[PDB]
Nucleic acid binder design. Structure first.
Lengths: 202, 203, 101, 69, 31, 154
RNA sequence: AGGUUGACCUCGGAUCAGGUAGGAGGACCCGCUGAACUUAAGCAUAUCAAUAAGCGGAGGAAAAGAAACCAACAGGGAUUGCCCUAGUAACGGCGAGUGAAGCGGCAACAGCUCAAAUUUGAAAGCUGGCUUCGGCCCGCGUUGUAAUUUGGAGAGGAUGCUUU
RNA sequence: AAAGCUCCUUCGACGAGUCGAGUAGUUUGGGAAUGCUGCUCAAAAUGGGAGGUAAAUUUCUUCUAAAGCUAAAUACCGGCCA
C-alpha cells in the first residue's frame, strides 16, 4: 500500500519536498475562504486513519483559525476586582484551535455530524485544519453498521460537547494517577467530593 | 475539623430512598432471574489473590478466567461466555498454584454443567441428553462456587517429634542479617569490583 | 526466575511459589522493527533527505565536536536520550556515507 | 522526453560563502554537505546495480506485507 | 428521525458468523 | 456486461457440473489502483509501470519513481490520469501496470519496455536529480536583460 | 473538421429530485467563560471558588468506559456509584484554612470496531430512478467500496474431527 | 460454502506538528510542572509512556498513546402519572 509511504513522508515535515508542498498549499488555502469545502482530502492517509471513507456521505471541509492566546473581552483592559484576576494579556484558551475550527465547521454544516479533524498547515497568523463530517441522513451511512452509531440523537454536536479526540484530550479523559481530578469529569468529581452524604441510621 | 465554609446546603444528600431502592433492586434481581431461568443469574468467577502485603493472605473472586486457564480446561474462548464463564484477557498466570486451582474450578463447573440443545429435535454430541437434563439445579454461582478458604488455617496440630529445628542463629538474627545484606548489596559489590580491579592492575 | 527466599526482608524476598515462563504477549512486540518498515523508512529517507538541524549536527560531527553536537541535539529534541540516539544515527549515516565510497 | 523550460540556477539553494550558522535558513544554505549527499547517492546506485527483457529485475529481494497463499 | 428497525439491526459479517456459530446457549448447573 | 455474460456461463457450467476453470481462461488485464500497483512493484511482479504526471496530492506518487528504480522496474511518467482512466474504465487512474500479457504480445511488450528503457529513462537519468522552477516573469526577464545589456555596454 | 472533436480537474447556477438544521425546555448531564460580598487585626498570596451570573450542546439519563491502568504483591484487571481509605498523604503569609489516590467489602457487570495487507482468476461493495418486482439503467468508487485482520492476536503451513 | 479447536520453520504491518522538551498563563493535595492551553523546538523503533525529589549510568516491572462504539448499577427544585 502507498499510505505507509505517505505516513512516513508526512512524518518528515522539515524536508525540502514537504516544506515546498506546505508553502504552496498554505498560500492557496490563504487565498481561499476561511471555511470552504475540500473536494478530496489533502492528506488521504491521515483522513483514512481518522475514519474517512470514499463513500457518499463523507465530506471534507478546510478551515483556518487565528492562532495565539486569548485576550479578555473587557472594556479598555480594565478588570474590576482583585489584582490576581486583573491580567488581560498572556491568557490562554482552555480548548484547542482544532476544537474551535471543529465547532465553526459544525455550525456551518448543521445537518452533518463532525466525525474528526486534522492539521494540514499553519503560518504565523493562521492554523489550517481539514474536518471530516458524516451525513446522518444518507442511506449508505444509515445502512453501514460501522458508522450508523452517529445517526443516534446522543451524538448531536460532538464537537460542541468535547466528544471528539481534541475534546477528550482537553477534558483529560485518561486513566491514571496524573488525571485524578478529570478522568470521569472534573465538575462531576468535584460535586461527588463536595456532597454531604447523610444516611438514615447515622 | 468541620468543612462548612462553602455552600454545602445545595449539595446535601439524604438517603430516605434506601428501602425503596432495595425493593427496586430486588425487583430487578427477580426479573433478571426469571428472564435467565434456568441458567444461574451470575457468571463463574476465578479465585485470585489480593495484591499488597496487607491483603495477600486472603483470596477473593476475580473478574474472569484467563485464556491459558480456558485452554488447559478445554473450554474454548468463544464458548465460555455463552455457557456462563467470565473471561479476562488481561490477567496472567505467573505461578502454577493459581493456574491449577482455576483449572480445577473450571473442570468442576464443566462436570456440573448441563447443556440444553439448540434444537431439541437434533441433539448434538456436546449437548446434554434429556435423560440427565433433569436434576437439582442451582441459581447462584457465587454461593455454589464461592471462596471456600479465603484464609489459611490458623490452627494446625503436629506431633511433638516433628517440631522444626529452626533457623540457625535465630529468626531475629536472620531478619537483621537479611536487612543488612539488602542495605549493603551495593557497597560489597563496589569492594569486590575494586579488589578485582586492583588484582588485575597488579597482575 | 530465581526462587524467592521465603522471608519478608532482604534480597529475593517473598512467598515461595513455583514460577512459570510465559509465552510472550503480542502487545509487547511493539518497537520490533519489520522488514517492510525498514524498506519504507529507508526509501522515504532517500526521497526526503536531511532536516536543517540534522545538517548542523552532521557538520559538527564531521568537525569532531561531539560534545557540542550532543548539546545542540539535546537543545533541539528535548531530552538527553533522544539527543544521544539522534547523534548515533547521524554517526551511522556519516560512517556509511564515507566507508563504502 | 518532453522537458519544460527551466531557470538558470538548477541546483539546491546554497550560500556556502556565508559564515553565519544561526537559524534554519543558515543550516539549509550555508552548510556544505555535497560530499556526504553524493556519497549517499553513489552508494544507493551501487546497491541498485523477449521474456528475459520482461522478467529482468534488480538484485534486491522482494518485500511482502504478508505470507500470501 | 430515528433509525429504521432493519438499519438498527444490521450487523457486520464477522458478527453474523460469530452469532451463528456461538450463540447464547441455554444451560443449567447442577447443585 | 462481459462480466455478467461470464457469470452466466460459469453458472451454467457449475449447473451441469464442470468447474468454472474449465470454461473460463486465465485473464490478462492492465493492473490499476495505487495500492495494488505498489504491492505488485514491491513483490516485483509488475513488468511495466505507467505513472500519471498530474496527480494531486503528489505525495501519492512522488515515491513511485524511487521505488521502481530500487526494484529495477521499468517505469514511465505519462500525461493524463484521465487518459489512464479511459484504459481502466474509470474517470481517472493514478498509475497503471502491466505484469503479464498473452503469448502473441510478448514481443510487443518487450519492444515497448526496451523503447522506454533507452528512450525515456536514459534521457531523464540526469534530469531527475535537477531542481525545477526558478523561472522569472516576462517583465522581470525584460528588466534583467536591459540591466545586463547596460552593464555590458558600460 | 484538427482554428476541430472530446476526456478529466476545480469552481458555479436552478422555486431541479429527495432530505436535514434552527426554536422551546434546561431539575439532573457535557464543556467554555468567570466574579465579588465573605473568612484571615486590615490585606495585594490564600479563602469564598475552579462557585454565582453569562454562552454553546444532548438524553431518559447524560458522561465515563474495555489500560500507553494500579501496583511492587503469593500480584490485581473496562467504566460508574455506595461504605471505608481519610479529615489521612499532601498543599498553604505551613495562618485562616484546603485536601485526594492505591488496596478492601458491596451494587451492577458485556464486550468490541477501524487505519496500517494485492480479491487481483475477474469492485465481489453502495446511493438514486423506472419497474412487469424478474431485474434494468444513471451514477459513487481503483487518490479504494465488500470479504479478511486488531495485539487477547493474527497471516501462512500442517492436521483430523466438530460447527451451522 | 463459511466456523472452531490442536501444533509450527517463518512472517507478524500497530495512528506525527503527535509524543516529548523549554517558556508563559491557569489549575491541582500534586510539592526542583498534577492537568489543560498558547508560542518555540521537535522525535524514535524492543521503540515509547509510567513507576509522586531534579540529573548521568546500568537494570527491572507494567501497559501500548496521539482513531472509534457500547447496556446496567448513578443523578434528577423540569415534564406526566400515582
Amino acid at each position: 500500500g502507498a499510505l505507509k509511504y505517505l505516513e512516513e513522508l508526512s512524518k518528515k515535515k522539515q524536508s525540502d519536498v514537504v516544506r515546498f508542498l506546505l508553502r504552496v498549499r498554505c498560500w492557496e488555502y490563504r487565498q481561499l475562504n476561511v471555511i470552504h469545502r475540500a473536494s478530496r482530502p489533502s492528506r488521504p492517509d491521515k483522513a483514512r486513519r481518522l475514519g474517512y471513507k470514499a463513500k457518499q456521505g463523507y465530506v471534507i471541509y478546510r478551515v483556518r483559525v487565528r492562532r495565539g492566546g486569548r485576550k479578555r473581552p473587557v472594556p479598555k483592559g480594565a478588570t474590576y476586582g482583585k489584582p490576581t484576576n486583573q491580567g488581560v494579556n498572556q491568557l490562554k484558551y482552555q480548548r484547542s484551535l482544532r476544537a474551535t475550527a471543529e465547532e465553526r465547521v459544525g455550525r456551518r454544516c448543521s445537518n452533518l455530524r463532525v466525525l474528526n479533524s486534522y492539521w494540514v498547515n499553519q503560518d504565523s497568523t493562521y492554523k489550517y485544519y481539514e474536518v471530516i463530517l458524516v451525513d446522518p441522513n444518507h442511506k449508505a451511512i444509515r445502512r453501514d453498521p460501522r458508522i450508523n452509531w452517529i445517526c443516534n440523537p446522543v451524538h448531536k454536536h460532538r464537537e460542541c460537547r468535547g466528544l471528539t479526540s481534541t475534546g477528550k484530550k482537553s477534558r483529560g479523559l485518561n486513566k491514571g494517577h496524573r488525571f485524578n481530578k478529570t478522568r470521569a469529569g472534573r465538575r462531576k468529581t468535584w460535586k461527588r467530593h463536595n456532597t454531604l452524604s447523610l444516611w438514615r441510621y447515622r | 475539623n468541620n468543612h462548612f465554609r462553602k455552600h454545602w446546603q445545595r449539595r446535601v444528600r439524604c438517603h430516605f430512598d434506601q428501602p425503596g431502592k432495595k425493593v427496586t433492586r430486588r425487583l430487578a434481581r427477580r426479573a433478571k432471574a426469571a428472564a435467565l431461568a434456568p441458567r444461574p443469574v451470575d457468571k463463574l468467577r476465578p479465585i485470585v489473590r489480593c495484591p499488597t502485603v496487607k491483603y495477600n493472605r486472603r483470596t477473593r473472586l476475580g473478574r474472569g478466567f484467563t485464556l491459558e486457564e480456558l485452554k488447559a480446561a478445554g473450554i474454548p474462548r468463544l464458548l465460555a461466555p455463552t455457557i456462563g464463564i467470565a473471561v479476562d484477557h488481561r490477567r496472567k498466570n505467573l505461578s502454577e498454584e493459581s493456574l491449577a486451582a482455576n483449572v480445577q474450578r473450571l473442570k468442576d463447573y464443566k462436570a456440573r454443567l448441563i447443556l440444553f440443545p439448540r434444537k431439541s429435535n437434533k441433539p448434538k454430541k456436546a449437548d446434554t441428553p434429556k435423560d440427565q437434563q433433569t436434576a437439582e439445579t442451582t441459581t447462584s454461582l457465587r454461593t455454589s462456587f464461592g471462596v471456600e478458604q479465603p484464609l489459611a488455617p490458623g490452627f494446625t496440630e503436629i506431633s511433638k517429634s516433628e517440631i522444626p529445628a529452626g533457623i540457625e542463629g535465630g529468626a531475629y538474627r536472620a531478619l537483621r542479617k537479611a536487612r543488612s545484606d539488602a542495605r549493603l548489596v551495593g557497597v560489597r559489590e563496589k569492594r569486590a569490583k575494586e579488589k578485582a580491579e586492583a588484582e588485575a592492575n597488579k597482575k | 526466575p530465581v526462587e524467592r527466599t521465603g522471608l519478608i526482608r532482604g534480597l529475593n524476598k517473598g512467598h515461595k511459589t513455583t514460577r512459570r515462563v510465559l509465552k510472550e504477549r503480542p502487545s509487547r512486540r511493539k518497537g520490533a522493527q519489520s522488514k517492510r518498515t525498514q524498506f519504507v523508512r529507508s526509501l522515504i529517507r532517500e526521497v526526503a533527505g536531511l532536516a536543517p538541524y540534522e545538517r548542523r549536527v552532521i557538520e559538527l560531527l564531521r568537525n569532531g565536536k561531539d560534545k557540542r553536537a550532543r548539546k545542540f541535539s539535546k537543545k533541539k529534541l528535548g531530552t538527553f536520550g533522544r539527543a544521544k540516539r539522534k547523534c548515533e544515527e547521524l554517526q551511522r549515516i556519516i560512517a556509511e556515507s564515507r566507508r563504502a565510497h | 522526453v518532453l522537458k519544460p523550460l527551466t531557470g538558470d540556477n538548477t541546483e539546491a539553494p546554497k550560500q556556502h560563502s556565508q559564515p553565519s550558522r544561526k537559524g534554519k535558513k543558515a543550516w539549509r544554505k550555508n552548510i556544505d554537505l555535497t560530499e556526504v549527499e553524493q556519497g549517499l547517492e553513489e552508494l544507493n546506485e551501487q546497491i541498485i546495480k523477449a521474456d528475459e527483457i520482461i522478467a529482468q529485475r534488480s538484485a534486491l529481494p522482494a518485500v511482502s506485507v504478508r505470507k500470501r497463499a | 428521525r430515528r433509525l429504521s428497525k432493519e438499519d438498527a439491526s444490521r450487523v457486520l459479517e464477522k458478527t453474523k458468523k460469530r452469532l451463528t456459530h456461538f450463540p447464547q446457549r441455554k444451560y443449567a448447573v447442577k447443585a | 456486461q462481459e462480466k455478467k455474460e461470464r457469470l452466466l456461463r460459469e453458472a451454467t457450467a457449475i449447473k451441469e457440473g464442470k468447474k468454472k476453470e474449465d470454461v473460463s481462461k486465465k485473464p490478462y488485464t492492465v493492473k490499476y489502483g495505487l495500492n495494488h500497483v505498489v504491492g505488485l512493484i514491491e513483490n516485483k511482479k509488475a513488468s511495466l509501470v505507467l505513472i500519471a504526471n498530474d496527480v494531486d496530492p503528489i505525495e501519492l506518487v512522488v515515491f513511485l519513481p524511487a521505488l521502481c528504480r530500487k526494484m529495477g522496474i521499468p517505469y514511465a511518467i505519462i500525461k493524463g490520469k484521465a487518459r489512464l482512466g479511459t484504459l481502466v474504465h474509470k474517470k481517472t487512474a493514478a498509475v497503471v501496470a502491466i505484469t503479464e500479457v498473452r503469448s502473441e504480445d510478448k514481443n510487443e511488450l518487450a519492444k515497448l519496455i526496451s523503447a522506454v528503457k533507452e528512450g525515456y529513462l536514459e534521457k531523464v537519468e540526469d534530469t531527475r536529480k535537477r531542481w525545477g522552477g526558478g523561472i522569472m516573469g516576462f517583465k522581470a526577464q525584460k528588466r534583467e536583460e536591459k540591466r545586463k545589456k547596460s552593464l555590458e555596454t558600460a
